[PDB]
Amino acid sequence: MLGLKTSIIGRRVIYFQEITSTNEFAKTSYLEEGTVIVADKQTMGHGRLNRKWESPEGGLWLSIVLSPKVPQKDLPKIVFLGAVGVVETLKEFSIDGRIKWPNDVLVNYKKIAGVLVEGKGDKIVLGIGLNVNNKVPNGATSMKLELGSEVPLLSVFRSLITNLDRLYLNFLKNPMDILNLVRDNMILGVRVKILGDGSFEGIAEDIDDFGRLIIRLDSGEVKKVIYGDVSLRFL
Amino acid sequence: MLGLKTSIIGRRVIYFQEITSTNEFAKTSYLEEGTVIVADKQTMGHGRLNRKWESPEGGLWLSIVLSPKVPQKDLPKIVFLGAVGVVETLKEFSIDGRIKWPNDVLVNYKKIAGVLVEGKGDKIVLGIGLNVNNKVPNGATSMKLELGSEVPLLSVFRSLITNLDRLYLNFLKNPMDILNLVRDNMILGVRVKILGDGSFEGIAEDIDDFGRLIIRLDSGEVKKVIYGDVSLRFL
Ligand SMILES: Nc1ncnc2c1ncn2[C@@H]1O[C@H](COP(=O)(O)OP(=O)(O)O)[C@@H](O)[C@H]1O
Numbered sequence: 001m002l003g004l005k006t007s008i009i010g011r012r013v014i015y016f017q018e019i020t021s022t023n024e025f026a027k028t029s030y031l032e033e034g035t036v037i038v039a040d041k042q043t044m045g046h047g048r049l050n051r052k053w054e055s056p057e058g059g060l061w062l063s064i065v066l067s068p069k070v071p072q073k074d075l076p077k078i079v080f081l082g083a084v085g086v087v088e089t090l091k092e093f094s095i096d097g098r099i100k101w102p103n104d105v106l107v108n109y110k111k112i113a114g115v116l117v118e119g120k121g122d123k124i125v126l127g128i129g130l131n132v133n134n135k136v137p138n139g140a141t142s143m144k145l146e147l148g149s150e151v152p153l154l155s156v157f158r159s160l161i162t163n164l165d166r167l168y169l170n171f172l173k174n175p176m177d178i179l180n181l182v183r184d185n186m187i188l189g190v191r192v193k194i195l196g197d198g199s200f201e202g203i204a205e206d207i208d209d210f211g212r213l214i215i216r217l218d219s220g221e222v223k224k225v226i227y228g229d230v231s232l233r234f235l
Numbered sequence: 236m237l238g239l240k241t242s243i244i245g246r247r248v249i250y251f252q253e254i255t256s257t258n259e260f261a262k263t264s265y266l267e268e269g270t271v272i273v274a275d276k277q278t279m280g281h282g283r284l285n286r287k288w289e290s291p292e293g294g295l296w297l298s299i300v301l302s303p304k305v306p307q308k309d310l311p312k313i314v315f316l317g318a319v320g321v322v323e324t325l326k327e328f329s330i331d332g333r334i335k336w337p338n339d340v341l342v343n344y345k346k347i348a349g350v351l352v353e354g355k356g357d358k359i360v361l362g363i364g365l366n367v368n369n370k371v372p373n374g375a376t377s378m379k380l381e382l383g384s385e386v387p388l389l390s391v392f393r394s395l396i397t398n399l400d401r402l403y404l405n406f407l408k409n410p411m412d413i414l415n416l417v418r419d420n421m422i423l424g425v426r427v428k429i430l431g432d433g434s435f436e437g438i439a440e441d442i443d444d445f446g447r448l449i450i451r452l453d454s455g456e457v458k459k460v461i462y463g464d465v466s467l468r469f470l
């Protein structure tokens with residue numbers, strides 16, 4: 001009855017009035033590629049660094065089952081597909097979403113969306129949490145707060161699914177293309193602090209051909225940050 | 236993201252761009268009570284009497300998984316819940332639908348919807364096919380043909396699910412109530428013919444406490460027609 005016209009993402013959609021976590025349901029259940037898990041609210045969601053995520057009613061909480069069979073070298077770039085899809089949808093609604101490496105989307109430096117990618121073997125689950133009309137944690141923001149009015153949740157869903165499907169199909173054939181889109185929509189040229197095994201600061205210059213964040217420390221040293229247990233803070 | 240507020244029916248919804256049959260999927264898959272299976276199109280759908288059911292894009296093709304904890308005697312009345320729910324939704328859109336015993340809904344004697352109820356294990360699958368914006372077989376009709384304009388498919392879905400949830404919750408407590416709703420919305424007082432073995436004609440007088448169609452033959456004989464592989468024709 002939704003009349004989706006996508007090729008892979010959205011072939012099937014499982015909607016829940018309530019769920020613990022769309023990513024957990026997607027990871028655990030036997031689902032076909034392209035199946036989307038979406039819920040009005042999540043009671044136990046979390047972000048990329050396993051830190052609690054608030055998912056009250058009004059937001060877009062979904063996960064997508066993917067089985068990308070691309071070279072092991074390009075597989076890690078899957079993490080950016082969700083962030084770019086969100087940016088494109090936000091632009092369609094005239095909201096200036098910008099990517100905070102590696103998976104977050106901010107608007108005026110306030111988080112409006114988070115991306116959580118989890119993979120086990122062939123199966124990759126792409127989770128996205130986008131604040132639309134819901135209340136958000138202090139410091140974060142939403143589409144409603146940015147536009148000054150409520151936005152039809154279903155319209156955002158249709159827009160995002162369409163963008164993601166296009167991005168995904170092109171990624172399977174041309175895995176490098178996504179990096180250019182990330183580069184054009186990422187927050188760069190500013191000082192940042194990289195938090196992992198210790199910490200270091202420098203200018204976030206760009207992302208390389210592997211999606212690594214390139215940081216220039218004041219000494220001139222160049223470090224390349226890989227996707228993982230690392231947090232980025234703007235100074 | 237659909238924001239359904241129903242209690243049981245619609246707690247979960249599985250949407251398909253394309254499916255063979257919503258009833259078959261609901262029958263062969265483990266699904267919690269209230270799960271709704273819906274598809275843009277069915278490639279192998281059929282009606283109560285096993286005849287192919289045209290399910291092209293534009294219509295509302297769904298199945299609902301139910302496990303009514305009511306006396307065995309009442310279980311057979313589920314089909315009526317579907318027909319009454321459709322009639323209530325049609326009225327909301329200013330369409331006067333009437334029930335053709337036991338599972339069809341007609342508008343000016345043209346079939347606009349069919350109900351197919353099947354049981355597997357201890358669960359019941361309530362299937363409903365409602366013509367909305369899709370092309371229909373000769374002699375049939377749709378909400379679009381009746382209103383002379385495109386009808387928002389999702390609005391019809393929301394309406395129907397809301398009506399069915401209400402009807403079902405009451406059925407669990409007062410299972411006899413549905414019969415009265417059926418009577419008040421069924422085509423009666425007209426001549427009909429029961430086809431097949433032992434075929435006969437008479438006036439469709441009413442339905443009894445078991446939902447059997449009461450027919451008065453010209454001889455004065457009274458026959459009670461049971462739900463099942465029964466074919467009826469208006470004379
Ligand atoms: N709905 C929400 N919108 C924006 N930010 C949120 C929301 N819910 C939680 N957060 C923030 O996001 C964090 C979860 O994402 P995570 O990637 O693990 O955090 P981090 O920002 O430390 O990388 C929480 O610790 C919280 O500060």
Ligand SMILES: Nc1ncnc2c1ncn2[C@@H]1O[C@H](COP(=O)(O)OP(=O)(O)O)[C@@H](O)[C@H]1O
Binds near residue numbers: 287288290348349
């Ligand atoms: N989308 C549709 N809308 C209305 N009627 C339909 C549709 N698809 C099929 N039909 C009609 O319904 C019949 C099958 O329904 P079924 O309940 O099994 O038996 P019958 O209606 O003949 O008693 C088909 O033979 C056809 O005439």
